[PDB]
């Protein structure tokens, strides 16, 4: 399987950004809700 | 019993249905409903692959009981051969198309 | 335009894409739910609360992964995308109906989401057995919504089963026999038949459950002369075929992947392979009761079901050994997909071997309803069905998209997930032999070590499914277009380039009648 | 390319699948409202959009086949398979209900009186109306066959006459069955006997109505000369469905009405 | 009396049905409007001459 | 009776670039919009009911 | 009961549970054989530069790999079935106890002679006396005579429950309206713990089982002081 | 209880139309008469509050929530007893 | 068929700007993963 | 008497009928010895068995059913 070089290459910085963002979008919301569990369990 | 009154295909069939109906009675098969019968496949007696363009995918069942069909594009031009068994195939313009 | 293309489709490729999108998203929800499960069990005590909120979570986990991730992806996604391409068909037999199959899914998913919001949700287990699922122990709209979600999902799957069988049987080139179609196509044609015959019995069962709790019937209520066990028979009659319906398309993709990366033309023992799936599909219909060993049935019948269940190992064995034989003289290419294929072959073997153990009613008495059975099915599902999905996804992504994935990243992703799933489910064999029951939000102090290790592994898996999302982004961000593909002589799906045009096989395919 | 050279049908984008999917949502959640928050407005809307969808989806199919001629031989062979397969899934749907019945009647729980029919239940007499319903359904089996044969022989009037007789027998059964329900000395709520009886014979009842509106549709398509002596799948299907329906009644009769009572 | 029967007559009645059926609806609703018929006036959101 | 399938075949085979579910006129169009409207509204109404029932 | 960092089964308190341990060892020995065989073949296949991508004849080897698994399955099936019948065997019990699952507690009934019946509830982790097991201690243990064939009859008065005691190799679902039978036979005195093995609602994890086995003499005096 | 009978080897529409009016319909007439003759109106069954009958675990979604759908007061008692 | 063809055109979402895409993928998979968390929260805040 | 012995007609994991049968049997015998006198002979065996095997709640409810005359079994 061969392919042409990237029409719009993603430099390391660009990757580091997309990787960080991808992580945060998963970890934040869950972290928040989980962080306040006790408050919910106590109303 | 007795009587009549219902239309017939010959008289009420339309669209593509009618086209294959007529085409079929003339003995021709423009909409590939039948399985094409093989020739000797030699350089001089190639299998003639009709086409409505300038390339058509040919599938070659090399040996009768084979479970693997060998696939490839047949282009307009000189006869070409199945990669696994030679067997010549030559493109040809597709006549009836309505 | 967008509407006409995406909401009013009649294109096997676009409907198939719509599925993969639905399945991936549902896959996120199911992953989140699996994490709450291990979050709750990762330290002695209660994090969420009582077995109700906990079991509501366990139930949604099962429904989401089974009905909304695995089935949509394998059958609707790969099924619709690849089948027509592999047999040279312009599309499917019923393009419109095919679309309804897809659109029935989002609503079905809504009903399931709705069920866990109203009241206290459905903490019944994915088996939604009565009396717990009844209008007394589970009053309210929840279970009813769970039932309706299942009705739609079932209508969706048997409508599609009808489409695949018709297409696969009726739309191949005139000179091509059934013994000339590829294993994947056979794999979905057989899965389609299992769905057609098992799904209706489920709908018969849950409709009876629905009337029992809204129309005063007593199908499963002793008071009126009913029998809670009757539901078990009906459910499980579908319930078993259902798991084969879940692994069969995976068997097919594996056959394709192993053969391709071994540089072989065809898989070893093609007709043995067809025989194997057919046997598996059939025996799969006469063994339901192995899920009811501790229910109080006759020793004799209990003996029948352990034997009947065991003979399934033979055909499954010819498949495992055939894939090995396929690798034999091959020119192996250590691509991501091949890595997923090898993992599957081993892990699935272990998980199915572990299922032969449970096949024994005597031993199952002490193994039933414990974490041993949780280990069995996660091996065959988390590292069986799922590994096939990943191998197939990374292998065909270029065909579907036209762009390529970063292989190194793709390999990193395998490494992480391979560690994660094993660490998660391996310990669970012990917890089960040692007695830890299923569906508990907390456990006796002794089970603390393994449950801890287990929960840690689930976090590594989390890391892997996060990375994958990125891996897909990068592929689409860089845009390396596909140029050349190997072995197309024997792999039709690739002959029209990546991605194949909206309309493929406009002018048929020429196949000689020798 | 551009112009196709295969005998298949590439159906135009239709909004109907979306519309029917939305319909299913509305009817299911609507039933949930009726059952719980005592409301039918939602259930009403769903039933509505649903009929709308079926009417249109099937109207188009007629357009594409009769008016546009897309139903070539290959396309038809596929429709035959589809119908067979569908009828099959149905056969297995009813199988859940006979399983239920036999399960209960073959091993009667003590709360029933340890017998079958449970003490307190006064079963209907198979030799009365059940026997009538049986003969009615069976006769429509012979008359729908006569219809089919007239059609193939191009006998317009007779096909119409037979299709009409067939339809009225189907209606006659519906009414007769309706009265039986009303006069029955037991109800859905009368334990497992009533459950088992009313949902099996009930679902079948729904099927006779579904099969009758289908034959009605066929009737009108014929009045409008849609069918040719050789291409009338719409009728073949209507006919196959109608037979599935007699057969299910034969099992109901023998199992529930005769054996289990 | 048999003359009423006929191939055109079937088509003819088929044709005349909309015009005469429309009259019946018009005649019926209008007659309700003329006798000021009760129970349907229950069903009208606007024209309730009753308090 | 009639027999004018020939008139309809022509009407529906007419190359007006219209999709079959609209190829037949203006009523096709109103039916379509009515159906579409009821479905979307209904769907909206259903979401409201669920939001409403989610709460104690 | 189960101890920290346990790998296999809890120690057998009764003879069929012993019988099971041995059968499991047998079965496990085989899964180790096959699962290691497959892994070896796999690594073997992937470790050579030599190729043979042309066609290979199947069927021939196909018999070996179809007849072998068939023989192995008999080797497991036989022992399995024997133990299976051995469990549902013709024995004559000298006592009959009944247990009734309830939403979040079990109740026992010894009624051969007198109508003795009590409720067995889990001791809240808060009111446990030092040395007591966190989610396993019940307030009223089900006392029974060691070295004797007892007949247990399991049922429920509500949803489904499952009465299990691993050390004795027992597990029987509790289905309302049904009387499931099982033979208990400990060959040694002590305290034997078990838990509800069926999802039954909010406190499914908090409704344990504790068997206390003493000699007949002490059993009967206990029974009387119980009413 | 039969075995079969008069063979007419050639079956066309005339044969099926013959069976329709010469067999099918006449049977529907006989049975109709039979059922019209055996029209014995059974006196409403004695009421006894059996617990396995007149089940009610959730009021029906209609009326007073205690009346089954095709409720016939003459032959169907409420849980409490006959209607009136 | 006015349906465009080729890489990046056979999908229901735009792949022309990698960062707009980043946002979309983030909301898509993100909202899917967060849903269970907020449902549990919702159930914990009822009475 | 120790406890109800093994019963060949009830050889499997399910004893529901075992409990049921003996409960009937006893009450059927009882009614007869009553309406016959025959020196008011008594069928204790059946009661010993049914009391051992039948959970209390079943016996209770059945007795009540027999009281109000809504007992479904034929005695
Ligand atoms: C795709 C998923 C999948 C697959 C394929 C299977 C496959 C099998 N499973 Fe299943 N199983 C589950 C998923 C799956 N299962 C799930 C979801 C549950 C739990 C549901 C619930 O109750 O909630 C479950 C539960 C379950 C039970 C009941 C446990 C209980 O008490 O609750 C049983 C018992 O018979 C069982 C057995 C088996 C067997 C015999 C196979 C066989 O197919 C295995 C075949 C494979 C091999 C045998 C290995 C390969 C072959 C060889 C190498 C040949 C040589 C080997 C030998 C001679 C042994 N499974
Ligand atoms: C498809 C089946 C499936 C899968 C894959 C999994 C995956 C996971 N499940 Fe499982 N689980 C079930 C189905 C599944 N599960 C079922 C049926 C039950 C029974 C419920 C009951 O008892 O009623 C159960 C029960 C269950 C339990 C037992 C709870 C109890 O009984 O008390 C636990 C606990 O650890 C658990 C955990 C997990 C974990 C940690 C994962 C992790 O391995 C998850 C890892 C994440 C993934 C593998 C998903 C990533 C894949 C994708 C997102 C696809 C992406 C899309 C594209 C590439 C296009 N599950
Ligand atoms: Cu199974
Ligand atoms: Cu319990
Ligand atoms: Cu429990
Ligand atoms: Mg269980
Ligand atoms: Zn060749």
């Amino acid at each position: 399987i061969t392919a042409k070089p990237a029409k719009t290459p993603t430099s390391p910085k660009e990757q580091a950004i997309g990787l960080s963002v991808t992580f945060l979008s998963f970890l934040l919301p869950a972290g928040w809700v989980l962080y306040h569990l006790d408050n919910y369990k106590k109303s | 019993a007795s009587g009549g009154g219902v239309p017939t295909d010959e008289e009420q069939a339309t669209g593509l249905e009618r086209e294959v109906m007529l085409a079929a009675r003339k003995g021709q098969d423009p909409y590939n409903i039948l399985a094409p019968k093989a020739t000797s496949g030699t350089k001089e007696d190639p299998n003639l692959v009709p086409s409505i363009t300038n390339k058509r995918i040919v599938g070659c069942i090399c040996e009768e009981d084979n479970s693997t069909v060998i696939w490839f594009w047949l282009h307009k031009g000189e006869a070409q051969r199945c990669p696994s068994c030679g067997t010549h195939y030559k493109l040809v313009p597709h006549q009836l198309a309505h | 335009m967008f509407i006409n293309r995406w909401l009013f489709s009649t294109n096997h490729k676009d409907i198939g894409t719509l599925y993969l999108l639905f399945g991936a998203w549902a896959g996120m929800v199911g992953t989140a739910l699996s994490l709450l499960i291990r979050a709750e069990l990762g330290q002695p005590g209660t994090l969420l609360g009582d077995d109700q909120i906990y079991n509501v979570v366990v139930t949604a986990h099962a429904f989401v992964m089974i009905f909304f991730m695995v089935m949509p992806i394998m059958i609707g996604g790969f099924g619709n995308w690849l089948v027509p391409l592999m047999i040279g068909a312009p599309d499917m037999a019923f393009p419109r109906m095919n679309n309804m199959s897809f659109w029935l899914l989002p609503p079905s998913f809504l009903l399931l989401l709705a069920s866990s919001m109203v009241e206290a949700g459905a903490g019944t287990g994915w088996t939604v057995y009565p009396p717990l699922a009844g209008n007394l122990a589970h009053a309210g709209a929840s279970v009813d919504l769970t039932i309706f979600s299942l009705h739609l999902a079932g209508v969706s799957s048997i409508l599609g089963a009808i489409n695949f069988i018709t297409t696969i049987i009726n739309m191949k080139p005139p000179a091509m026999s059934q013994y000339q179609t590829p294993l994947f196509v056979w794999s979905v044609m057989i899965t389609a038949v299992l769905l057609l015959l098992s799904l209706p019995v489920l709908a018969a069962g849950i409709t009876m459950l629905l009337t029992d709790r809204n129309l005063n019937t007593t199908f499963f209520d002793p008071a009126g002369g009913g029998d809670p066990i009757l539901y078990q028979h009906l459910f499980w009659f579908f319930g078993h075929p259902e798991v084969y319906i879940l692994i069969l398309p995976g068997f097919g993709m594996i056959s394709h992947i192993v053969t391709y990366y071994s540089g072989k033309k065809e898989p070893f023992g093609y007709m043995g392979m067809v025989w194997a799936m057919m046997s598996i599909g059939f025996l799969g219909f006469i063994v339901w009761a192995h899920h009811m060993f501790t229910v109080g049935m006759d020793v004799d019948t209990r003996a029948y079901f352990t034997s009947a269940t065991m003979i399934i190992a033979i055909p499954t064995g010819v498949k495992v050994f055939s894939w090995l034989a396929t690798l034999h003289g091959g020119n192996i290419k250590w691509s991501p997909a091949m890595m997923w294929a090898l993992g599957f072959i081993f892990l699935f073997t272990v998980g199915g071997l572990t299922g032969i153990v449970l096949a024994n009613s005597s031993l199952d008495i002490v193994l039933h309803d414990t974490y041993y059975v949780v280990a069995h099915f996660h091996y065959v599902l988390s590292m069986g069905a799922v590994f096939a999905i990943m191998g197939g996804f990374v292998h065909w992504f270029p065909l579907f998209s036209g762009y390529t994935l970063n292989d190194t990243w793709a390999k990193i992703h395998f490494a992480i997930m391979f560690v994660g799933v094993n660490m998660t489910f391996f310990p669970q064999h012990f917890l089960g032999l040692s007695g830890m029951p299923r569906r508990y939000s907390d456990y006796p102090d002794a089970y603390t070590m393994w449950n801890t290790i287990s929960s840690m592994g689930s976090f590594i898996s989390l890391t892997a499914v996060m990375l994958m999302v990125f891996i897909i982004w990068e592929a689409f961000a860089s845009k390396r277009e596909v140029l050349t593909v190997d072995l197309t002589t024997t792999n039709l799906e690739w002959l029209n380039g990546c991605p194949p045009p909206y309309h493929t096989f406009e002018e048929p395919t020429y196949v000689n009648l020798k | 390319m551009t112009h196709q050279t295969h005998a298949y049908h590439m159906v135009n984008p239709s909004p109907w699948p979306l519309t029917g999917a939305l319909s299913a949502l509305l009817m299911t959640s609507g039933l949930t409202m009726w059952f719980h928050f005592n409301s039918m407005t939602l259930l009403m809307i769903g039933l509505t959009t649903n009929m709308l969808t079926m009417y249109q989806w099937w109207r188009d199919v007629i357009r594409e086949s009769t008016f546009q001629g897309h139903h070539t031989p290959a396309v038809q062979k596929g429709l035959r398979y589809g119908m067979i397969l569908f009828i099959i899934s149905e056969v297995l749907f009813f199988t859940g209900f006979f399983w239920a019945f036999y399960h209960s009647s073959l091993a009667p729980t003590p709360e029933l009186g340890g017998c079958w029919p449970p003490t307190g239940i006064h079963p209907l007499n198979p030799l009365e109306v059940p026997l009538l319903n049986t003969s009615v359904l069976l006769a429509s089996g012979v008359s729908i066959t006569w219809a089919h044969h007239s059609l193939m022989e191009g006998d317009r009037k007779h096909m119409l006459q037979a299709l009409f007789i067939t339809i009225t027998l189907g209606v006659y059964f519906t009414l007769l069955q309706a009265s039986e329900y009303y006069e029955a000395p037991f109800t859905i709520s009368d334990g497992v006997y009533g459950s088992t009886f009313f949902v099996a014979t009930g679902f079948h009842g729904l099927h006779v109505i579904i099969g009758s509106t289908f034959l009605i549709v066929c009737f009108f398509r014929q009045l409008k000369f849609h069918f040719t002596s050789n291409h009338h799948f719409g009728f073949e299907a209507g006919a196959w469905y109608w037979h599935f329906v007699d057969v299910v009644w034969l099992f109901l009769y023998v199992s529930i009405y005769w054996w289990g009572s | 009396l048999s003359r009423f029967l006929g191939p055109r007559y079937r088509e003819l009645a088929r044709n005349w049905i909309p015009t005469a059926s429309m009259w019946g609806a018009v005649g019926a609703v209008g007659l309700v409007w003329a006798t000021d018929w009760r129970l349907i006036l229950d069903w009208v959101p606007y024209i309730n001459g009753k308090f | 009776f009639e027999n004018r399938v020939a008139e309809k075949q022509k009407l529906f085979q007419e190359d007006n670039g219209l999709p079959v579910h609209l190829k037949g006129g203006a009523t096709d169009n109103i039916l379509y919009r009515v159906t579409m409207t009821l479905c979307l509204g209904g769907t909206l109404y259903s979401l409201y009911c669920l939001g409403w029932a989610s709460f104690p | 009961m189960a101890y920290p960092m346990q790998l296999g089964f809890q120690d057998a308190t009764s003879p069929i549970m012993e019988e099971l341990l041995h059968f499991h060892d047998h079965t496990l020995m085989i899964v180790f054989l096959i699962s290691s065989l497959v892994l070896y073949i796999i690594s073997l296949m992937l470790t050579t530069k030599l190729t043979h991508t042309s066609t290979m004849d199947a069927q021939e080897v196909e018999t070996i790999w179809t007849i072998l698994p068939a023989i192995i399955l008999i080797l497991i099936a036989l022992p399995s079935l024997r133990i299976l019948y051995m469990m549902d065997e013709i024995n004559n019990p000298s006592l009959t106890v009944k247990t009734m699952g309830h939403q979040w507690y079990w109740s026992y009934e010894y009624t051969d002679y007198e109508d003795l019946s009590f409720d067995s509830y889990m001791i809240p982790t808060s009111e446990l006396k030092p040395g007591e097991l966190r989610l396993l201690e019940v307030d009223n243990r089900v006392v029974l005579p060691m070295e004797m064939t007892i007949r247990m009859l399991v049922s429920s008065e509500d949803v489904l429950h499952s009465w299990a005691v691993p050390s004795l190799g027992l597990k029987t679902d509790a289905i309302p309206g049904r009387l499931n039978q099982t033979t208990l036979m400990s060959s040694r005195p002590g305290l034997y713990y078990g838990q509800c093995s069926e999802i039954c609602g909010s406190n499914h994890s908090f409704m344990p089982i504790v068997l206390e086995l003493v000699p007949l003499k002490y059993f009967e005096k206990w029974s009387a002081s119980m009413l | 209880a039969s075995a079969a009978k008069g063979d007419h080897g050639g079956t066309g529409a005339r044969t099926w139309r013959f069976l329709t009016f010469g067999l099918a319909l006449p049977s529907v007439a006989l049975c109709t008469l039979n059922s019209w003759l055996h029209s014995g109106h059974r006196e409403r069954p004695a009421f006894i509050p059996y617990h396995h009958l007149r089940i009610r675990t959730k009021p029906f979604s209609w009326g007073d929530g205690n009346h089954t759908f095709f409720h016939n007061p003459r032959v169907n008692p409420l849980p409490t007893g006959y209607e009136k | 068929s006015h349906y465009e063809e080729g890489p990046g055109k056979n999908i229901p979402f735009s792949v022309e700007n990698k960062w707009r895409l980043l946002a979309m993928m983030t909301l898509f998979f993100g909202s899917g993963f967060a849903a269970p968390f907020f449902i549990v929260r919702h159930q914990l805040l009822k009475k | 008497y120790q406890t109800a012995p093994f019963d060949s007609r009830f050889p499997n994991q399910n004893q529901t009928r075992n409990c049921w049968q003996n409960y009937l049997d006893f009450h059927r015998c009882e009614k007869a010895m009553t309406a016959k006198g025959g020196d008011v002979s008594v069928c204790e065996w059946y009661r010993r068995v049914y009391k051992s095997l039948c959970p209390i709640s079943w016996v209770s409810t059945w007795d009540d059913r027999r009281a109000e005359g809504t007992f479904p079994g034929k005695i």
Side-chain angles (χ1 to χ4, degrees), chain I residues 27-41:
Chain I
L27 261 50
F28 181 73
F29 298 102
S31 69
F33 185 80
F37 294 94
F38 287 85
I39 295 176
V40 170
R41 205 186 80 117

Short mmCIF file of all heavy atoms in Angstrom, two decimals, chain I residues 27-41:
data_model
loop_
_atom_site.label_atom_id
_atom_site.label_comp_id
_atom_site.label_asym_id
_atom_site.label_seq_id
_atom_site.Cartn_x
_atom_site.Cartn_y
_atom_site.Cartn_z
N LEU I 27 -15.98 17.34 19.64
CA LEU I 27 -17.36 17.41 20.14
C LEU I 27 -18.06 16.08 19.94
O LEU I 27 -18.72 15.57 20.83
CB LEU I 27 -18.14 18.48 19.42
CG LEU I 27 -18.30 19.84 20.10
CD1 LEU I 27 -16.96 20.38 20.58
CD2 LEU I 27 -18.95 20.79 19.11
N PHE I 28 -17.88 15.49 18.77
CA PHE I 28 -18.50 14.22 18.43
C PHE I 28 -18.16 13.11 19.44
O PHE I 28 -19.02 12.66 20.21
CB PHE I 28 -18.05 13.83 17.02
CG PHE I 28 -18.64 12.56 16.53
CD1 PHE I 28 -19.97 12.49 16.16
CD2 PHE I 28 -17.86 11.42 16.41
CE1 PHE I 28 -20.52 11.32 15.69
CE2 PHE I 28 -18.40 10.23 15.94
CZ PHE I 28 -19.73 10.19 15.58
N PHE I 29 -16.92 12.66 19.44
CA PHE I 29 -16.52 11.61 20.36
C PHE I 29 -16.60 12.08 21.80
O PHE I 29 -16.95 11.32 22.69
CB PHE I 29 -15.11 11.15 20.05
CG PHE I 29 -14.97 10.57 18.69
CD1 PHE I 29 -14.42 11.30 17.65
CD2 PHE I 29 -15.43 9.28 18.44
CE1 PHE I 29 -14.33 10.76 16.37
CE2 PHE I 29 -15.34 8.73 17.16
CZ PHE I 29 -14.79 9.47 16.12
N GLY I 30 -16.33 13.36 22.01
CA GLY I 30 -16.35 13.91 23.35
C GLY I 30 -17.70 13.85 24.01
O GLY I 30 -17.83 13.39 25.15
N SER I 31 -18.73 14.30 23.31
CA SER I 31 -20.07 14.29 23.84
C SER I 31 -20.53 12.85 24.07
O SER I 31 -21.33 12.57 24.93
CB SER I 31 -21.03 14.95 22.87
OG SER I 31 -21.16 14.12 21.74
N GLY I 32 -20.02 11.94 23.26
CA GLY I 32 -20.40 10.55 23.43
C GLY I 32 -19.83 9.96 24.70
O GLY I 32 -20.52 9.24 25.42
N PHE I 33 -18.57 10.28 25.00
CA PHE I 33 -17.92 9.76 26.19
C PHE I 33 -18.41 10.40 27.48
O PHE I 33 -18.42 9.76 28.52
CB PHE I 33 -16.41 9.94 26.08
CG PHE I 33 -15.63 9.32 27.21
CD1 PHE I 33 -15.36 7.96 27.22
CD2 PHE I 33 -15.15 10.10 28.25
CE1 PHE I 33 -14.61 7.39 28.24
CE2 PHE I 33 -14.39 9.54 29.28
CZ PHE I 33 -14.12 8.18 29.28
N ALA I 34 -18.86 11.65 27.41
CA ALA I 34 -19.31 12.35 28.60
C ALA I 34 -20.72 12.01 29.05
O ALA I 34 -21.04 12.08 30.24
CB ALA I 34 -19.20 13.81 28.39
N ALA I 35 -21.56 11.62 28.09
CA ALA I 35 -22.95 11.30 28.38
C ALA I 35 -23.18 10.39 29.60
O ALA I 35 -23.91 10.75 30.53
CB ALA I 35 -23.64 10.78 27.13
N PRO I 36 -22.54 9.22 29.65
CA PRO I 36 -22.77 8.37 30.82
C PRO I 36 -22.47 9.08 32.15
O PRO I 36 -23.22 8.96 33.11
CB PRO I 36 -21.82 7.21 30.57
CG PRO I 36 -21.85 7.10 29.08
CD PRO I 36 -21.70 8.53 28.67
N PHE I 37 -21.40 9.88 32.18
CA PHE I 37 -21.03 10.60 33.39
C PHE I 37 -22.12 11.54 33.87
O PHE I 37 -22.49 11.54 35.04
CB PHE I 37 -19.71 11.34 33.19
CG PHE I 37 -18.55 10.42 33.01
CD1 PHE I 37 -18.13 10.06 31.74
CD2 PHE I 37 -17.95 9.81 34.10
CE1 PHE I 37 -17.14 9.10 31.55
CE2 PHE I 37 -16.95 8.85 33.93
CZ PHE I 37 -16.54 8.49 32.66
N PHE I 38 -22.69 12.29 32.93
CA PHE I 38 -23.76 13.21 33.27
C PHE I 38 -25.09 12.52 33.57
O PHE I 38 -25.94 13.08 34.28
CB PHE I 38 -23.89 14.30 32.21
CG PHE I 38 -22.77 15.31 32.26
CD1 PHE I 38 -21.56 15.08 31.61
CD2 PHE I 38 -22.89 16.46 33.04
CE1 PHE I 38 -20.49 15.96 31.73
CE2 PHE I 38 -21.82 17.35 33.16
CZ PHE I 38 -20.62 17.10 32.51
N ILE I 39 -25.27 11.30 33.09
CA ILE I 39 -26.50 10.57 33.39
C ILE I 39 -26.42 10.12 34.85
O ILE I 39 -27.37 10.29 35.61
CB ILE I 39 -26.69 9.33 32.51
CG1 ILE I 39 -26.88 9.73 31.05
CG2 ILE I 39 -27.92 8.57 32.98
CD1 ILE I 39 -26.98 8.53 30.11
N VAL I 40 -25.27 9.57 35.24
CA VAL I 40 -25.05 9.13 36.61
C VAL I 40 -25.25 10.33 37.52
O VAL I 40 -25.97 10.26 38.51
CB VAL I 40 -23.64 8.59 36.79
CG1 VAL I 40 -23.35 8.37 38.23
CG2 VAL I 40 -23.50 7.29 36.05
N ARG I 41 -24.67 11.47 37.16
CA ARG I 41 -24.84 12.68 37.95
C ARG I 41 -26.31 12.99 38.11
O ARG I 41 -26.80 13.21 39.20
CB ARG I 41 -24.19 13.86 37.24
CG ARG I 41 -23.78 14.95 38.17
CD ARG I 41 -23.28 16.16 37.42
NE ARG I 41 -24.41 16.95 36.94
CZ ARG I 41 -24.67 18.20 37.32
NH1 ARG I 41 -23.86 18.80 38.20
NH2 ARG I 41 -25.72 18.84 36.83
#
